[PDB]
Design a binder for this molecule. Structure first.
Ligand SMILES: [NH3+]Cc1cc(-c2ccccc2)no1
Ligand SMILES: [NH3+]Cc1cc(-c2ccccc2)no1
Lengths: 348, 348, 348, 348, 348
């Protein structure tokens, strides 16, 4: 017996939808849901989605509160919809998927993922929920996550990190590293060998290797000397060049984090969403050096060093394809006289 | 001669409604009030209330700009309406009360609190305003604050802190500690003996006793040893247990402040309002330990230690009622073999 | 061939309007522009202006992304409209000017500033764009900026700082110091000798002279002694008096920055816009000292010291006019027995 | 090259989307699309749909302007989507279908109905458009309309009337009677024998048989005598009983039309949509007789007489199923002593 | 002392703005203005304009309530703004002009039309208001209306009809026929010889000549015989051809009125505004004959006959220009063998 007043009762009393019985008085005005608390209206939810306010409130209340794959991973794996859960996209303040299965009467296309409407969609399945591994085996299209082995299914080890209530973390009290599986047209697909992005923030960036500790602590020329990166244009690509009106390089998150400690800068996130490669309109506050489209990726410095050192440096320009977060990321590699000039995630 | 243009003139020229004559051009679009300044529209107010935009703008302009009791105190005392002022609720960005008395023609139920419509309502009176002590004596229901003694009225010493323009502070240049008085059905009511919450923030938490300085500086086991808290489950209740998927304890603000210095965490304020006990959906970023409903109270550590040490520890589970901010707060006390297992502000 | 879908394509692919061909799917709901990215809506723009959402989105996409004069300078110079560009006002999240010339079909009053509709308006011209110096020579009213000399035109050296994508900075990789020129009724006007405001923030305030370094580092009495400021009421005007309910003085940004390091305080920006003098409703969190209208100016301490020391101190009260950012700023100077009592930017 | 400005140009110049090149200035405010005409804003469209305003404007501009099947017929035949057109639902002021095929980038699930996403959907095909009879030949699910014979397919003669720009009419200058074909999972279905509703209005009702002319002209008792309708409760079912507080019968549109000529009444259309049976909250203005749910069907009186005269009248109450507009309509038949008491389209 | 509350007081008590003192409580919600009447909100105004709700409410309250020229006339004469009045455009539910002079602080560009901002605008002047004939004497650009003679100026006799509170009428108790004067750049213009549109409605159409009485009463062939109209294609142009899918001719309002008496039809007013020629998407309900863009003009039948009989009929196709309502209306004239095939107001 689903209702707006029951969803609101669950939010007020349980912090989210918890299947509890009860009703609280609710008022909807414009895009906000309020509840009366001791004579006055208290805001429960502000709709930032393109769905109706009461519908978005219900999907947000029904969000998955266990560590789940980051939306960029689900997107890279072609996930269209989730089986009997809502993956909330905290970067967009919206449901990661348009439709639902067995969640909300307004957005449901089916009650169970076995319904024929779900067959052409890549349904996300969670092995931590009873019966979901079986539903994946029976699904025409799907993505499955598990905490352990599934008999006969060849796994793909996913990233160490997962999103728990919008906080990306490597779990200590909970498991965040999942086995990943995918099916296309009834056939289990071999997930490719891949690097993973580290999902760090600029302001609270922490190094995850001795090379990253050395990058943040050492001066530019001694880090390049220590790690034998001469001729690999780290001065441009990673450290960034702030000497001309157009900001040069600065494509690795660690390089932005290093710069941020010394001088602040504005990063305009003009397409705010979770993605393997992010595009920012950057303006350096100290110099005035800027770039409309600065592609930034958060790779572990060792992984980036491994990618660039593996490259043939004998051609002027070429596309270098690298699997990152299960997706093919195109990089533009520019060389001259056997040395790198630039290497960046190619702006489509 | 009240008007939208006159209220806006006062905001622009006086920083708030100050009874000054004058008009400025105003435009209202959706929920925002703008004023024309040198040919362009400048935002004066964004309506976050459930009242009409022009009405909410007037109540906000007419807000009390002197140190006033925090909304949680007024609510705990049963205050329905204020006499000839607006107590602005900065936690909700809205008037603390639905109706007004002698403030705004759209929200007024009366011009004076002596009107019979006010008799069944608990009217808030401010002894710092001429004639308000007399109006309280004549009111059927009411709450009065004063800076000094009222002849024959037995006072209740309120908290040291008050809210001045949304800033909770213990006044040095202004008085923030008031005497409190209450009347129910024409009869002056004895306010109970009470503890007070400290109204501190997580990010700018400052200790207000030697015990609080010792809690923040000493390690867990030496603080428990120094203050003889063995068998009182401070490891769980105050420090917090981040070892399991469900976050254990963590019900005192000081414990959250200590944790915040070392590791960050998300506190989802799912019912955003001022209250003695706050409920948060907490997610620890370091471990992934989380709790949908984590009740948090900001008591002075000495007061919490005094409350828990006063308890009989011979029963498995019982409700412990403690007067805090004039309200009865129920705590759930769980014991085993004469020692505390947990003690928390009981989730209703 | 201008279109909503083409503007959105440019934002998504180029970080702003860049004259590129292409279209992306767009949805408009209420005041927000979204684009479909892999099946889900992603927010591109939230309209905070009084213009229609699609119109404001286009003007924001078409904003000038080169270092431009800060809006306070343009306003002080009487600028009504810009020639073939949009000066985006980042303090208001809106176009600095109501109308456009050769920018957007909904806001354009003309395609070229030579059209007779532009003659009575003070058009902003940018010498860095080909043909704009010539358009200024032919304009009846206008303001021109250049990076160098214009034959026969007597220049005015503007501030060192300019706004680049909303970041106020003194350019190192780009030029931010412009020559300024103005015409009124076909006649080139002599711009007056002026001081410039420093455009600093409270939280990231940096001293720009040895006197400012000494103000932030030295104690009040030794700074006043070192710079011979006895009898100039710096204790009141610059340092601020937090001993009474009404906050005394505190009119220089550097004094607020010094106070902010020790004790936090709330600054209510009740008219949020760029201006030479700013008015704040200030509440000191430590003491509870407050002021509804506290005028604050960010002058270099040396310039303020030079202004106040140049004053005749023999009259009780008088208006002192000082040219700052090309505008006449009135200050109220109060003296007693040949010493300053107060000196503040006069509240109109 | 689809765009908001181009759609608006087509509406302004061609009365609808006509594939013409050009752009007009547009402004979007709340749910309304305006265009500038000689300096002032002129309303082009008001969004009454649940889609974004600019998306709904485009679908409405791209509506089919030829006589098309009434939405109730398409719904009764299970139509999910239309092939390369928009069937505009004038009763709801909205698109008849959620998604489109080759119409609008925001709503399109495919560009051609041959795409595999369309195979499980019942696609509407219009034989008047080149290649659509052939697209229905290879479609898995679909409904086809034609003006003539299709080789190899036996036709189902549809209603005489069609909707042309929201006007339901029997065409004289255009053909409105179509042949209907339907296929489910690649198999051409045998459409059932069906009656059709007449789709008339209460205020402009015209009789379409000699029996209907006699019903409107003759008195109740002489019409029942002429057509030998004694014992079939036409006094209750068709004429209506306005003698008690609850309005009795009145389930045939012709009976409402007859009553409307003499006395006015209110019909509250509480579910405003096109449907074979309509439900109204009726209040008779003359008597005050009313009914919350009065089911009304517009059958040709001869067809209703044939249905009621082809029923067994020996049971107290039973469900009578009748194919009307290709759907199964349940009627509740109530009898006593071999005579009808009531017969109405069953409220379920 | 202008105010929202004072404007509302005038609307409630005087039916419009009447300069009366007083205030009523007002609430603004979305685009609607309400007033409290005995405890409940009563709607005063719904904003259908692109201006802010409170601004549009004031301009509507301040509308001219005397018979004024129809907006189509003012537009055709190039009127930009009115002197100290608001011409309310009832066809658009909006002010006829963007800006005002001495009316509303939000829309005013000047207080008096003698201000230099008004010199390049064609200001509307009303000789019925004291001093306006004299203000037109010294205005650079303007249109003047008078009820009588102006010394030194030759008049242009305007239409018999004017708009009084949105009702177009030929005044009997008030004068609606004005003398028109116009000046461009200080020079009094010679207004051209012009026909006038009759501004009639389809449903309440009344003939204004013996020819119009004969058109409405006689059959098609005897009217054409009586007025010797053989070969002028009145059967197509005026009567309309409803025999093919595309509706033929039907460009004179009188022909639509004649058709409307016999058979109803839908006229979709896709550009709702006052104009000399109107464009409708017409659907004939009886036949299904339709036309996306059917240009309709309401000329007196005698005037249309004079125009068509004063043309050379020897060319296949040509543009015929006719001054109607002071503007040049282009007609497309199509001939064959010395006879008219069609003649219609040119869709451009
Ligand atoms: N072979 C199954 C089938 C045949 C058709 C079909 C459709 C149109 C004409 C003739 C045949 N549609 O499905
Ligand atoms: N001298 C040029 C001129 C004359 C007028 C004018 C206007 C009204 C009456 C008589 C003259 N308007 O412009």
């Amino acid at each position: 017996a689903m209702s707006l007043e029951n969803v609101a009762f669950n939010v007020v009393n349980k912090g989210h939808f918890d299947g509890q019985q009860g009703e609280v008085p609710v008022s909807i005005i414009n895009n906000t849901v309020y509840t009366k608390v001791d004579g006055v209206d208290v805001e429960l939810f502000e709709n930032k989605t393109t769905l109706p306010v009461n519908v978005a409130f219900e999907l947000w209340a029904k969000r998955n509160i266990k560590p789940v794959p980051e939306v960029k991973i689900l997107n890279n794996l072609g996930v269209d919809i989730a089986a009997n859960t809502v993956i909330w996209d905290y970067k967009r303040d919206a449901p990661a998927h348009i439709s639902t299965i067995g969640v909300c009467s307004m957005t449901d296309i089916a009650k169970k993922p076995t319904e024929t409407i779900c067959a052409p969609l890549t349904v996300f399945f969670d092995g931590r929920v009873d019966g979901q591994v079986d539903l994946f085996r029976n699904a025409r299209n799907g993505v499955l996550i598990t905490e352990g082995s599934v008999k006969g299914l060849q796994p793909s080890v996913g990233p160490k990190q997962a999103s728990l209530n919008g906080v990306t973390l490597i779990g200590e009290a909970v498991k965040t590293q999942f086995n990943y599986y995918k099916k296309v047209d009834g056939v289990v697909q071999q997930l490719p060998e891949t690097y993973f992005t580290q999902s760090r923030n600029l302001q609270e960036f922490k190094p995850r290797s001795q090379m990253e500790i050395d990058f943040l602590e050492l001066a530019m020329d001694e880090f390049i000397e220590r790690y034998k990166l001469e001729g690999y244009a780290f001065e441009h690509i990673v450290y960034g060049d702030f000497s001309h009106s157009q900001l040069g390089g600065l494509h690795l998150l660690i390089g932005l984090a290093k710069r941020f400690k010394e001088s602040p800068f504005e990063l305009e996130d003009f397409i705010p969403m979770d993605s393997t490669v992010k595009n920012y309109f950057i303006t350096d506050a100290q110099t005035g050096s800027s770039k409309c489209v600065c592609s930034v990726i958060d790779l572990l410095l060792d992984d980036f060093v491994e990618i660039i050192k593996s490259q043939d440096l004998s051609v002027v320009s070429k596309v270098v394809k690298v699997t990152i977060d299960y997706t093919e990321i195109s990089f533009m590699l520019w060389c001259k006289d056997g040395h790198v000039e630039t290497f960046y995630p190619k702006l489509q």
